[PDB]
Specification:
homodimer; mainly alpha; Four Helix Bundle (Hemerythrin (Met), subunit A); 4 helices; binds chloride ion; Methyl-accepting chemotaxis protein PcaY (chain B); signaling protein
Chain lengths: 133, 143
């Protein structure tokens, strides 16, 4: 079950890295569109979508495998904060498709706040996994 | 052996936090540039401050990581990570300068320096995580 700890750590760390890369790509893509780099922006938008799908799958696996009573509530809190973040990054993508600076501003506050919480929740989970091992 | 095992985990954790804050740092510049272009200068300035904060915390973790990377199986990767992070931090600083100056043209080149260096940072993290985990397991197989 120590092998399970390593699999859980890989899922959590990769999910969060891919999730922030998804958002970074959509913001970069938006700036590319502003500069007229429209073929390059589309690559960024495709990578944002793909990174969202991959990171969501890893979060889902993480919560499927976080059965221990010490982790159950914290893993669901991670599931919920991650869903909040993913819905903000989907908002960033829609604002980019609409080329709307104001729509981007509205949703970006939600994205930054949910990512700040993901960083602190990750540390809580790392600590619980660490005592679990 | 529990000491060297707790050290191996701390190192992996420094690396993970450092890379997450580093990517966040660049994302905040990009999204701060979009906020500034939409007239939200106060939010954009907070994002520039957060970009600086995050990359300075990352830098401190990378430096501490290298200081604690003694084994030859690890210090070569670690000094590459530190050298690559230096390039990355400079490119993100260039992104912030381009934002404060409101220049798309300056932005685009450095976002590219930044993304290149970040691609390399990501691979080095993977290699270092695997190397740390191999050392932890080697200790275990000793026990
Ligand atoms: Cl953030």
């Amino acid at each position: 079950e120590l092998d399970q700890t390593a699999h859980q750590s890989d899922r959590l760390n990769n999910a969060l890295l891919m999730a922030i890369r998804s958002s970074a790509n959509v913001s970069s893509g938006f700036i590319e569109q502003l500069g007229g780099h429209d073929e390059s922006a589309g690559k960024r938008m495709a990578l944002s979508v793909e990174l969202n799908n991959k990171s969501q799958a890893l979060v889902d696996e993480f919560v499927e495998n976080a059965r221990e009573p010490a982790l159950r509530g914290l893993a669901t809190e991670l599931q919920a904060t991650f869903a909040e973040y993913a819905k903000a990054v989907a908002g960033q993508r829609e604002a980019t498709r609409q080329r709307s600076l104001e729509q981007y501003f509205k949703v970006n506050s939600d994205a930054g706040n949910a990512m700040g919480r993901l960083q602190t929740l990750r540390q809580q989970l790392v600590t619980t996994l660490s005592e679990r091992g």
